[PDB]
Curated annotation (Swiss-Prot), chain A:
It comes from Oryctolagus cuniculus (Rabbit). InterPro entries: NA-bd_OB-fold, Ribosomal_uS12, Ribosomal_uS12_euk/arc. The modification N6-succinyllysine is found at residue 54. NCBIfam families: PRK04211.1, uS12_E_A. This is Small ribosomal subunit protein uS12. Component of the 40S small ribosomal subunit. Part of the small subunit (SSU) processome, composed of more than 70 proteins and the RNA chaperone small nucleolar RNA (snoRNA) U3. PROSITE patterns: RIBOSOMAL_S12. The gene is RPS23. CDD domains: Ribosomal_S23. The modification 3-hydroxyproline is found at residue 62. Pfam families: Ribosom_S12_S23. There is a cross-link at residue 37 (Glycyl lysine isopeptide (Lys-Gly) (interchain with G-Cter in SUMO2)). Residues 1-26 are annotated as: Disordered. Hydroxylation at Pro-62 affects translation termination efficiency. GO terms for cellular component: cytosolic ribosome; nucleolus; rough endoplasmic reticulum; small ribosomal subunit.
UniProtKB/Swiss-Prot annotation, chain C:
Transmembrane segments: none annotated. This is Small ribosomal subunit protein eS30. Component of the 40S subunit of the ribosome. Contributes to the assembly and function of 40S ribosomal subunits. It comes from the Eukaryota. Disulfide bonds: none annotated. It is found in: Cytoplasm; Nucleus. The chain holds residues 75 to 133 of 133 of the full protein. The modification N6-succinyllysine is found at residue 51.
Curated annotation (Swiss-Prot), chain D:
One of its GO terms (biological process) is ribosomal small subunit biogenesis. The modification Phosphoserine is found at residues 147, 157. One of its GO terms (cellular component) is cytosolic ribosome. It is found in: Cytoplasm; Nucleus, Nucleolus. It comes from Oryctolagus cuniculus. One of its GO terms (molecular function) is rRNA binding. This is Small ribosomal subunit protein uS4. SMART domains: Ribosomal_S4 (SM01390), S4 (SM00363).
Length: 142, 126, 59, 182
RNA sequence: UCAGGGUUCGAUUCCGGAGAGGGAGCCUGAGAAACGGCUACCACAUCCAAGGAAGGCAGCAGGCGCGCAAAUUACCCACUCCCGACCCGGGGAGGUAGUGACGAAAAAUAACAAUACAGGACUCUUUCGAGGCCCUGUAAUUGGAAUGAGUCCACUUUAAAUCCUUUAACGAGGAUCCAUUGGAGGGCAAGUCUGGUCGCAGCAGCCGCGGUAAUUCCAGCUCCAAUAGCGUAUAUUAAAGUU
């Protein structure tokens, strides 16, 4: 309520809504494309890179742990992304200066859990999954 | 076995000089018998003798019990021999093909294209 | 204690015992797996006074 | 070419109330999965949507007459509805279970020769029945009303006339090569 | 996708349009500013006896490169149509097969008796107890019965063949002719079981678990959900009367 309800006010409605839609956060990222330019991804679900070097990443309080991530440079941008490594002992199955395949966490822009500064994780080392390396139904191909 | 040949929608197709019907066949504990055997029985149901009869089709339904095809019967041989697509005549032999596979034609054609006046070498000779 | 640093990975998984008791018994699939599920829950017919039991109880 | 789905999934993933109904319904009729249940309920809820239109259309609109008349005939022809009803209001009184009575495996058990329902499904698949003259292998035949008085066993089977199976004739050859020559 | 009103997508089998490495010009013809025609410049790239000459796969296959990301240098004018001087010739148009868990439809992976315990209506008996009916799983072995999964002669299919349907002959005793993918603290269907670890290692969309008694970690057993499918990442709609 508190607004026009004319019969010839189609212009004053459809131009107002087209302006006040930009104050929404979601809409403003989709249509400016500043999302694409700023992201290390092109909007692609995955991406591929080459390892730079292992790191240890401290946890946010209350939790205290060391989380053993990696840091990676990409093939098609040359810029750098810091990527989590999953389950116990899977760090060892990643060896420095090889290729890897990365993927987002599942929150689509934001850092997940108690680990800060990480927005990406790792899925395949070299056409072989972290699962089959971990479980033992496959072996290192080298 | 004892089998039944049974008509279905006859036509006297005067323009092509033939008689075309459906070949509706019942088989009791068997089904799917040679097409050669079928045209024998149709020979001794219109007395036209089995070299001007031609049949094809014959897909058999589930569990057997029925099979249905499509048959022609020509008045004379020469009306079949003229009209008839070649492979149906060669189906029970009196014709063949050669010709010879495929390809050997096109690679010769493009070689014939690049000569003028005399192409008799390439037609025999490569 | 913790000795030989606590940054070490493979720690918990490389010092645990590994045991098994893999099946000889074949489990059912498709139809019959639903048949047993129907009978074992509803058509037995056991239920008694108000209880918390669940379909599992290894307590 | 042209393809479309014949079922839908429930909006809720879990719900104690729902799951028990779907389970106990599958138990009675011997169904393999919930996909065999939701299939039925898609068709039903589709028919419940079409009916829900025509009741709001003007009485004696030509669209309303021709549709309803030919619709109710089809519901009567499969026998999920009576002609002592024969109006659109009884479409909404129709429900899920009445369909399942007209399933092939249900009619084998209910009005023919079977043990438990779990047996009867196996007989349909192992080609020991027919519907009028025609072998079937589909327990989801849904059976027209007229064809209920032609459900018979098959004419080539060890159940009734026809050649025995390989368990019997095996043991017959155990009388000749298992204890007759071996 | 959706109650009503909408929102989002449309390279892509039909119709219209534009373009054949980038620009420009032009010949022929009824029709073209044509590229399976031509000429020139520009960017490329090939052969050469160095005098010269020849080229444009956003046609079908195929290769390199690019990337998260995508098939056979197969068979054939029989169908469907087109082109010609033509009933006869030609067509990578088009049809056929191969690869194919994009996706959709169909629905196997054990059914039935014997014994064995087990339950309750029913009957007898004061009750105990016994009989007995309807069924249930569950042990023990089995028994009888059935079938395609496969293997496979024949017929059929078709341009020739494959597949499918049809039919010989072999083909089920559960140990194998083997169903997996996730989960069990709450949201949310299912363990305050056993062993190991001790704020370490890890789990955790979210809330939170781990500091020696861990229902959440690593394993075992059991249980739950969906099922020939299930999980994960990302775009997007509904949920959002949070446009």
């Amino acid at each position: 309520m508190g607004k026009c309800r004319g019969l010839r006010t189609a212009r004053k409605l459809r131009s107002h809504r087209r302006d006040q839609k930009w104050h929404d956060k979601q809409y403003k990222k989709a249509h400016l494309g500043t999302a694409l330019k700023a992201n290390p991804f092109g909007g692609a679900s995955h991406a591929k890179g080459i390892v730079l070097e292992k790191v240890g990443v401290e946890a946010k309080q209350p939790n205290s742990a060391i989380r053993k991530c990696v840091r990676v440079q990409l093939i098609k941008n040359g810029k750098k992304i810091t990527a989590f490594v999953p389950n116990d002992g899977c760090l060892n199955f990643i060896e420095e200066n090889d290729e890897v395949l990365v993927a987002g966490f599942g929150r689509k822009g934001h850092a997940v859990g108690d680990i800060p500064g990480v927005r990406f994780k790792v899925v395949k080392v070299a056409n072989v999954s972290l699962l089959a390396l971990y479980k033992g139904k496959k072996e290192r191909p080298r | 076995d004892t089998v039944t040949i049974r008509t279905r929608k006859f036509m006297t197709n005067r323009l092509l000089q033939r008689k075309q019907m459906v070949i509706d066949v019942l088989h009791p504990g068997k089904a799917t018998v040679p097409k050669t055997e079928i045209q024998e029985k149709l020979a001794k149901m219109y007395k036209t003798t089995p070299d001007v009869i031609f049949v094809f089709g014959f897909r058999t339904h589930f569990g057997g019990g029925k099979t249905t095809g499509f048959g022609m019967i020509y008045d004379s041989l020469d009306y079949a021999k003229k009209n008839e697509p070649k492979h149906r005549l060669a189906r029970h032999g009196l014709y063949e093909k050669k010709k010879t596979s495929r390809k050997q034609r096109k690679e010769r054609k493009n070689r014939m294209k690049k000569v003028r006046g005399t192409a008799k070498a390439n037609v025999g000779a490569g | 204690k913790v000795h030989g640093s606590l940054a070490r990975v493979g720690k918990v998984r490389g010092q645990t015992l590994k045991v098994a008791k893999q099946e000889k018994k074949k489990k059912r699939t498709g139809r019959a797996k639903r048949r047993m599920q129907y009978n074992r829950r509803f058509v037995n017919v056991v239920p008694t006074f108000g209880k918390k039991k669940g379909p599992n109880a290894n307590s | 070419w042209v393809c479309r789905k014949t079922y839908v999934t429930p909006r809720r993933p879990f719900e104690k109330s729902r799951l028990d109904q779907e389970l106990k319904l599958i138990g009675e009729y011997g169904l393999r999965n919930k996909r065999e249940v939701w299939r039925v309920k898609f068709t039903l809820a589709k028919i419940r949507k079409a009916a829900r239109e025509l009741l709001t259309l003007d009485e004696k609109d030509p669209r309303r007459l021709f549709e309803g008349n030919a619709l109710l005939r089809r519901l009567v022809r499969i026998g999920v509805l009576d002609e002592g009803k024969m109006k659109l209001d009884y479409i909404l009184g129709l429900k899920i279970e009445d369909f399942l009575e007209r399933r092939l495996q249900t009619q084998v058990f209910k009005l023919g020769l079977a043990k438990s329902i779990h047996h009867a499904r196996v007989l349909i698949r192992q080609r020991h029945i027919r519907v009028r003259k025609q072998v079937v292998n589909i327990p989801s035949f849904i059976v027209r009303l007229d064809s209920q008085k032609h459900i018979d066993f098959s004419l080539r089977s060890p159940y009734g006339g026809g050649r025995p199976g390989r368990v019997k004739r095996k043991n017959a050859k155990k009388g000749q090569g298992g204890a007759g020559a071996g």
